[PDB]
Amino acid sequence: ALGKLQDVVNQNAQALNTLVKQLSSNFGAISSVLNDILSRLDPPEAEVQ
Amino acid sequence: VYAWNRKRISNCVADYSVLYNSASFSTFKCYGVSPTKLNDLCFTNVYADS
Amino acid sequence: PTYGVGYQPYRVVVLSFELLHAPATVCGPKKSTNLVKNKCVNFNFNGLT
């Protein structure tokens, strides 16, 4: 019966989850964590990724 | 070269700025990491292939 | 000895790093500080800055 309300909450949480998971995507960079690229590459090379 | 000799290195602390400081190496390049930042960066194993 | 530079012998050493999900066993000349808890600190656990 409470579908109309549960679904809204589900959608919001889904959006949040998708947005958070987008942080793990490489997007073509060598690593998905900024700290790794910073600690491993020089700024002239780090900025490319 | 066909029999390149590989040495595994583990359980030890070694600096890395010394090699970069020494200019006796005609070519000194790195891929995926910077030699300067390499000093303070641990690793599980190192392979030296000569 | 009389061969050209492109033909002269050259010693080549390739260092390859393996950083798996195992305790890091090769580190650099970095001292270890006493652990501090319950505070906003800048931590570096065997490279996991």
Question: Distance between the two ends of chain B, CA-based, in angstroms?
Answer: 8
Helices (H), B1-50: 17-21
3-state secondary structure of B17: helix
Identify how the structure was determined. cryo-EM
User: SS3 string of A1-49?
Assistant: CCHHHHHHHHHHHHHHHHHHHHHHCCCCCCCCCHHHHHHHCCHHHHCCC
| Contact list, C43 vs chain A (CB under 8 Å) | none
3-state secondary structure of B19: helix
Resolution of the coordinates in A? 3.6
Q: Are C48 and A33 in contact (CB under 8 A)?
A: no
| Contact list, C47 vs chain A (CB under 8 Å) | 39
Q: What residue type is B35 in one-letter code?
A: P
Cα Rg for chain B, rounded, in angstroms? 12
Residues in chain B, total: 50
Alpha carbons A38 and A36: distance in angstroms, whole number: 5
